Structures are given as structure tokens and as C-alpha cells.
Amino acid sequence: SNEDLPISMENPYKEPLKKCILCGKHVDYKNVQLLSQFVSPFTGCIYGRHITGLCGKKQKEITKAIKRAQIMGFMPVTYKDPAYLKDPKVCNIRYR
Amino acid sequence: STDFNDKILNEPLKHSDFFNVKELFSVRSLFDARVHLGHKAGCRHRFMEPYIFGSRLDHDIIDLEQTATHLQLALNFTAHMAYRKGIILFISRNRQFSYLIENMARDCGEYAHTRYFRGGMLTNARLLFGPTVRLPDLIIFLHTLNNIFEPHVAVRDAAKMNIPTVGIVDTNCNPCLITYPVPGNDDSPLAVHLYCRLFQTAITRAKEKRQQVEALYRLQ
């Protein structure tokens, strides 16, 4: 009938759905190095998702892993292990 | 008097396009002036959907075919009113085009109100201006929205006072009470200039044709 009329399709220009840094990666309570990347260096508090930039599922995984490691003796509770203070910062917190 | 009126006022009402307004524009001219660009899909108004061709990347596209038909009707109405010597008042609160619209009104011999529409200009006209004042016979809205994205109160007041309203309605406007809506882009300078030129040309053609017909009748 008419070829210039718009066609029914999806959005070919759709930008990729942003993926959390941990998407597709296995959060384990033994990976204390990864877990310490989401705990405050000074108080040991677990950062919120507004700081970690994690999806809900990965935030819950991180929290459960941190608690399990802390109670199983893999991770300090009140502070970040000093061995990991110099790891790639991935948290949107600026104390100074 | 009877024959004069019969052949002057009622003669043009027997022709589909007595003033030949269709030649004043084409869908290509409207496109070149960008009459087809609306606001984002979020600003869309529920009553402007019938005139929206679609949504190009969340940007509404106004159906220029419907715009052409509506613009034909609006220009024909405006030409007939100017021919009948009615008062045509151009309303627009777009400060970017206030000066232009005032100049167009002055040039075409009609009136303009591009300033803060004080309450009662139309509903309280007899008290404000005088008991014998003559209200506009047609109101042409170059921007049916005020400066806070609400419909111009003149639209409601004109509907109240039974003054027909031509009006350029964007995708975020409310054409319900505008007698002759012209779906189009009221924010681009090109589109506003095209609308001003079209209405000016139609009104001038109507007035000059009125003079010519009067001369033809009175010379015989």
C-alpha cells in the first residue's frame, strides 16, 4: 500500500541495560577481598546500594556473604581488613 | 441594502474556496517550516492524540495532512471574517514572538493582545472599555498556552462570549474549546513566521477582495 508508513518493530537504538559490576560473577563468602570492597574502611558498615551501585539481587548477595563470612571467621566485623584498603575503589563514597 | 447584502455578504458563502487560501501553503511548506514537530511524548495532551502522526524517539510528530485540512478551514474562516469586516484579534503570550505578532497585526490592520491578559478583557469588556465597545469577531491564538503551560484564559473567555477562535495547538495543548484548531508547531520561529504570514496574507486578500467586490457592485 504505502512503503513510507512507519513499521511496527522494537527500538533498534535502545541503549544496553546497564549491568552492575558483579552481574554474572559469583559472590562467595570466601572472597573476602571482594566483600571488603563494599564495607566502610573505618566502621566496617556495609554500604547501601546507593553507594555500591549494585542491583538488588547482587546487593542482597553481598550482604548475606558479608554476614556469613563475619560469623564464620573470614572477615572482620568492625572494620575493613587493612590488607584490602588498597583495592580498586568501587564505592561512591568520599569521606574527605 | 437588501441586494447589496445579498450579493456582498452571502455571495462568497456559495464557494468552497472563495479567497483561494489553499494556494497560500502546501504540506511541503509546512514541513520545511517544521510545523510537524511536537513536544516529548510525556508532555502530550490527551485531546491532541488524533492529530499526532506518531512518536519518533519519544518526540511527537503532528500529522501534516490533518494540519493541512485544519489550516485550510481556519484560513478560510479568517478570510471570510476579514471580508465581512469583523475584528480579528491575535493572542500570543510567547514573548519570543510578541513583537512579530504585534507587527503582523498592525500591518494587516487587525488587533493584537500579546501582553498579560488582564482578567475580564472579554467577559468584563463593557465595564472595562465602555458599554458600547465592540468585542472581537474572531480570535487567532498563535500560542494557546500561557507562560506556565496552561491554556490561555482567553480561550475560555472567548468560548463564553461566543467569539470563534482559530488556534495553533501543539501536542501539549487542549483543542477542545478552540473552534478551528490547527495542529502544528507553535515553538519554532519558522513555524510561527509561517502562521503569521499565512494569516496576514489571508486577511489582506479578504479585505482587498471585499473592496474590489464593493467597487464592482457600486460602479454598476
Binding site: - | 458563502l13 512518536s55 475560555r156 473552534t179
Partner: protein, 135 residues
């Protein structure tokens, strides 16, 4: 004494009804013109509503088959260095030239999308277009 009930009917209907009733002795100047050339819709006030349930606006997004080619081009080569000139009605971007070449190559009878993409890129290089890949 024109009725000031802008929510009840249209100006035409109210004027006509009052003239019929005899309230208005003379038809207003615009009545004959309106009756001769009425608008496509009678301007009756309607209160707007917000759609609530499964109802959605009937506006359909304007897509074309070449939009896929344009998206692939922008994802592979980026915007480019030739800035758009939207004032010229006949302006053609590098993406549009790629789209035309892809379309004619498809008309030639090639179906493979990646082969069409690479062939079009090479053809544009031959024509003298600096298709700079973003990655």
C-alpha cells in the same frame, strides 16, 4: 445575551439555539461563515481524564526498516566527524549514505546482514568515505 455556558454545547449550538428561541435578535457576524464552513469537530468542552487501567495512548512509535541499519552504523562507527546540517532539506549524513548503499546491495540479492555491513563499509571506503570504527 449570548449564553456564557462554555461547558454546555459549542458556541455554534448555543448561538443557534438562542436565535431559534428569540433571545438573540440578530445572528452574530460569524454565524453564517461557521454554518457554511464548519470545523471538522464541533468545539464542545470535554474534561480530560488520565488513563488508568490497561488503556494506553494509541500513538505508535515511528520506526522504519532502515532504523536497524542506522542503529548498527552508529554502534559500529559512532556519530562521525561530519556534523549534521538540519537546515538543508536534502542533507545526507554518512549514516544515510551507508543506508542507501546497504539498501542497493540488498536489492542486488544479498541476505547476510554482516556481509552486507562489511561490503557496504568497503564500498564506502572505495567511494572515499572515512568510516572510522569506534572499536
Amino acid at each position: 445575551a449570548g449564553s456564557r455556558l462554555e461547558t454546555v454545547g459549542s458556541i455554534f449550538s448555543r448561538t443557534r439555539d438562542l436565535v431559534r428561541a428569540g433571545v438573540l435578535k440578530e445572528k452574530p457576524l460569524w454565524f453564517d461563515v461557521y454554518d457554511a464552513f464548519p470545523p471538522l469537530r464541533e468545539p464542545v468542552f470535554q474534561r480530560p481524564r488520565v488513563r488508568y487501567g490497561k488503556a494506553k495512548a494509541p500513538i505508535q512509535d515511528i520506526w522504519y526498516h532502515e532504523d536497524r541499519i542506522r542503529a548498527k552504523f552508529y554502534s559500529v562507527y559512532g556519530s562521525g566527524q561530519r556534523a549534521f546540517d538540519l537546515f538543508n532539506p536534502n542533507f545526507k549524513s554518512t549514516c544515510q549514505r551507508f543506508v542507501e548503499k546497504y539498501t542497493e546491495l540488498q536489492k542486488l540479492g544479498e541476505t547476510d546482514e554482516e556481509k552486507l555491513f562489511v561490503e557496504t563499509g568497503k564500498a564506502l571506503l572505495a567511494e572515499g568515505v572515512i568510516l572510522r570504527r569506534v572499536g
